[PDB]
């Protein structure tokens, strides 16, 4: 009959707080409606079947409805949220002006809350994430339109307004790299795709229920996962404390189980805990290790485990005749001053690096198939760490006297 929730909102209908009505996706996974937290009211989306509420999306997080009066409806071919005084508190800002009737709002099976035309999607929640990436969502750039889709944490456990932490892709550098910011402070670097996985999150791997990928083409630079078992819920969320995590609902545990959490190590993962020309290692003391062929810029500081100034070459470079030390199991250093040619290989890369008197290091861009592509760095090497069982080769340029064969 008609007690149960619909997945549709037509132009003549409305959803209000006082009615307690919600929208439910076909397949019954997601539910959309009003909820109360921190003395404010919000429009949002959660998992329908979980007794504990997990909000995967909030429409008006920085624009709260003041009180228990709120109305969601289509107005002049636009989705709008009106408070007690008929004032719009939130709305979709249209990408067209010649939108035709009928305009319909619709919650899809994958949790996309969508405004559409007979002509197609006009607006999508999938494009405006809160703190959470769902399966099928795109994390990163839409190149045609310039839209960077990124995550921002709730301010606290109770306050969904924009927190200090954001997890975002930055493409203004040699390679696309994910970063975690706290306001404007750069606090953790996930780094580039490698391309099995991201350099700085080695736990991410294919599971029995989900696969993931990173698309870097003419249309987009973005990350996506799909869950291949409809009865399993998995998601990526940056929590209010600044950790980016994969969480999977695991019934036997009665909990959102954290598959992984980033940063994983307070010792080695924070951004630049070791200075330039050194790397962090969780199994050594001090944590920061000079690169082979380098010495500490300030030894007295270095012995006191003050690693700030980092390390420098023992011997000045002479370009012609220089060699390399091969570093193993590495998180590649930050690519602000780096270049990439994905079409050439390791030998061609060493040659190109050797020939360039400014190149200080080089590495493969992709680790699949025994490794391909060329990444070249100039200047200081920053934010390096190693791993016991993951990571990648990095060749750092040295004067001939300091090379080992």
């Amino acid at each position: 009959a008609a007690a149960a929730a619909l997945s549709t909102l037509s132009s003549t209908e409305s959803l209000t707080i006082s009615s307690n009505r919600t929208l439910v996706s076909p397949g019954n996974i997601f539910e959309l409606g009003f909820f109360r937290t921190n003395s404010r009211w919000y429009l949002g989306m959660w998992y329908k079947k979980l007794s504990g509420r997990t909000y995967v999306w909030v429409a008006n997080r920085d624009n709260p409805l003041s009180n228990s009066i709120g109305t969601l409806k289509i107005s002049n071919m636009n989705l709008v949220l009106l408070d007690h005084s008929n004032k719009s508190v939130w709305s979709t800002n249209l990408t067209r002006e010649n939108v035709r009737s009928p305009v319909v709002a619709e919650l899809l099976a994958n949790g996309n809350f969508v405004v559409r035309d007979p002509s197609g999607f006009l607006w999508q929640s999938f494009d405006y994430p809160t703190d959470t990436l769902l399966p099928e969502m795109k994390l990163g750039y839409d190149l045609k339109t310039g839209l960077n889709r990124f995550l921002v944490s709730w301010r606290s456990s109770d306050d969904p307004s924009s927190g200090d932490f954001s997890y975002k892709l930055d493409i203004q550098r040699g390679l696309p790299e994910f970063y975690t910011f706290k306001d404007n402070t750069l606090v953790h670097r996930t780094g580039p795709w490698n391309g099995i996985r991201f350099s700085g999150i080695p736990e991410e791997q294919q599971l029995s229920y989900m696969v993931y990928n990173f698309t870097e083409n003419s249309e987009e630079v973005a990350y996506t996962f799909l869950v291949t078992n409809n009865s399993i819920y998995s998601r990526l969320t940056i929590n209010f404390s600044g950790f980016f995590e994969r969480l999977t609902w695991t019934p036997s545990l009665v909990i959102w189980n954290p598959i992984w959490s980033s940063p994983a190590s307070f010792q080695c993962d924070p951004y630049m805990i070791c200075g330039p020309g050194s790397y962090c290692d969780v199994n050594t003391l001090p944590l920061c290790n000079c690169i082979q062929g380098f010495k500490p810029l300030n030894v007295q500081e270095w012995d006191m485990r003050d690693h700030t100034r980092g390390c420098i070459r023992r011997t000045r470079l002479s370009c012609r005749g220089d060699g390399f030390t091969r570093m193993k199991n590495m998180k590649l250093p930050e690519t602000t001053m780096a270049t990439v040619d994905r079409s050439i290989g390791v030998k061609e890369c060493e040659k190109k690096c050797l020939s360039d008197c400014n190149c200080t290091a080089f590495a493969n861009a992709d680790i699949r198939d025994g490794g391909t592509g060329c990444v070249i760095w100039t200047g200081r090497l920053d934010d390096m760490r190693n791993y016991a069982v993951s990571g990648q080769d990095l060749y750092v340029r040295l004067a001939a006297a300091d090379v080992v064969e």
């Binding site: 007794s51 504990g52 509420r53 950790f243 969480l247 036997s252 545990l253 009665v254 909990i255 959102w256 189980n257 954290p258 959490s261």
Partner: protein
């Protein structure tokens, strides 16, 4: 008389319903019902402390 503790820990956090979640977790793991369960959550870990006899 006077209660004892059954201890069940895992990754994650308490959430707003830790006590109830813990009590369900106990039942699933033991096929019994606890008097109640305490839940606390530091170190990215959920610690269920379940009151059992004895």
């Amino acid at each position: 008389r006077k209660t004892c503790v059954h201890r069940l820990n895992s990754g994650g956090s308490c959430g707003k319903s830790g006590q109830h979640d813990c009590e369900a977790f106990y039942t699933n793991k033991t096929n019994q019902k606890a008097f109640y369960c305490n839940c606390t959550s530091p170190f990215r870990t959920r610690y269920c402390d379940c009151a059992i006899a004895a």
